[PDB]
C-alpha cells in the first residue's frame, strides 16, 4: 500500500523543530542554530507495514504571524507540538499551539503528538510527569526526544502518523 501525510512541526523558537526534522530527513544533528522561516521536506517510510510519503512542513517558532500560520494548520493533517525540556516557557506555550490547531481545523479531535525535546541535556526544568499529565488531558501521546542522540526521533513522527490513521478510522 501507499498513502501520504502532511505533517506540520510547531512550537516555540529554539526547541529543536528543525533539528528533529533534519535528523529524520538527513540523519545528522545540526549543532548550529539556523533560525527557520519555512522549510519543507519529503520522505518515504514504512510504518506498521504500510508505506507512506511524509510531507513535513517545518515552521518557525513565531508568535507575530499567527494569521499567516493559520494556512499551514489548515492543510496539515497532524501536528508535532514540540517544547524543550530545559525551556519552561516553551512548555507553557504548548496550550496556545493546541488552541490554534483546534481553531483552524475546527475540531477538538486533531491528530497531534506532544514532543519533549533535548532530553540529553542536564538542565531540565520541565518534569516528565508535568508533560505526561498535559498530554493525558489532551488525549494525545507524549514522546521524549533528543535530536542530538536521535533518541525518539522516528518514534515521534511515526506515532503522529498512527494518530492520523486512528483519526481517519473514526
Amino acid at each position: 500500500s501507499m498513502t501520504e501525510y502532511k505533517l506540520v512541526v510547531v512550537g516555540a523558537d529554539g526547541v529543536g523543530k528543525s533539528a528533529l526534522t533534519i535528523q529524520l530527513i538527513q540523519n545528522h544533528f545540526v549543532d548550529e542554530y539556523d533560525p527557520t522561516i519555512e522549510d519543507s521536506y519529503r520522505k518515504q517510510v514504512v510504518i506498521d507495514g504500510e508505506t507512506c510519503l511524509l510531507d513535513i512542513l517545518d515552521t518557525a517558532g513565531q508568535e507575530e504571524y499567527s494569521a499567516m500560520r493559520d494556512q499551514y494548520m489548515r492543510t496539515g493533517e497532524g501536528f508535532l507540538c514540540v517544547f524543550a525540556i530545559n525551556n519552561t516557557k516553551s512548555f507553557e506555550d504548548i496550550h496556545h499551539y493546541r488552541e490554534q490547531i483546534k481553531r483552524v481545523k475546527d475540531s477538538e479531535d486533531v491528530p497531534m503528538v506532544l514532543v519533549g525535546n533535548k532530553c540529553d541535556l542536564p538542565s531540565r526544568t520541565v518534569d516528565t510527569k508535568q508533560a505526561q499529565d498535559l498530554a493525558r488531558s489532551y488525549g494525545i501521546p507524549f514522546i521524549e526526544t533528543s535530536a542530538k542522540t536521535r533518541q525518539g526521533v522516528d518514534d515521534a513522527f511515526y506515532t503522529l502518523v498512527r494518530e492520523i490513521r486512528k483519526h481517519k478510522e473514526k
Partner: protein, 166 residues
C-alpha cells in the same frame, strides 16, 4: 544632510563587487540607534560590519544582515554592550529603502538590521527605524534577486567595505 551622517556599504556577491549603497542615518530623531550603526560602519570601536553577510534576503520584504560575532544570523553586538533598548518608535516602515533594527523581542537591539524593499507596516512599534537608503536602491534591488522565499541566498552577499561619507 547638515545633521544626519551618511554611511556606505560596498556590497559583494561571492567576493565580486556589486555596487555601493549609502544610507542617511536619522541622528536627528533616533540618535543612539543611528550612532551605533554609524560607528559599526566605520569600525572605529574595533569591530563592526566590514566583512559580514546579508544572511536573510526575502524578495518583496527585506534584506537582513549585520551578524559579525556569530556569523550565522544569531549574533551581533552594539557599541553599548551586547544589547540596547528600543530608543523610540517615531518612524515607521513606510516603504522601500527604510533601514530598521532586527531584534529578538523588546529591547534586544545589537547590530543586526534590515533594509525594507516594500512597506512592512506590521513591524511598526516593534522594530526601531533609524535610517533610509540614500543612493544605490538599485543595488538593494539587485541583492533582493539573490534571495528566496525562506531567505536563503543563492550566492553569498557581503559587506566588502563600509564607512562614513563626508
Amino acid at each position: 544632510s547638515m545633521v544626519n551622517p551618511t554611511v556606505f556599504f560596498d556590497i559583494a556577491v561571492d567576493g565580486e563587487p556589486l555596487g555601493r549603497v549609502s544610507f542617511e542615518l536619522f541622528a536627528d530623531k533616533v540618535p543612539k540607534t543611528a550612532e551605533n550603526f554609524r560607528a559599526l560602519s566605520t569600525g572605529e570601536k574595533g569591530f563592526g560590519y566590514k566583512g559580514s553577510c546579508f544572511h536573510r534576503i526575502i524578495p518583496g520584504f527585506m534584506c537582513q544582515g549585520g551578524d559579525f560575532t556569530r556569523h550565522n544570523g544569531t549574533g551581533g553586538k552594539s557599541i553599548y554592550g551586547e544589547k540596547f533598548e528600543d530608543e523610540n518608535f517615531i518612524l515607521k516602515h513606510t516603504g522601500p529603502g527604510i533601514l530598521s533594527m532586527a531584534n529578538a523581542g523588546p529591547n534586544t537591539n545589537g547590530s543586526q538590521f534590515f533594509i525594507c524593499t516594500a512597506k512592512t507596516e506590521w513591524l511598526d512599534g516593534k522594530h526601531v527605524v533609524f535610517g533610509k537608503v540614500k543612493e544605490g536602491m538599485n543595488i538593494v534591488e539587485a541583492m533582493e534577486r539573490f534571495g528566496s522565499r525562506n531567505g536563503k541566498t543563492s550566492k553569498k552577499i557581503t559587506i566588502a567595505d563600509c564607512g562614513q561619507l563626508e
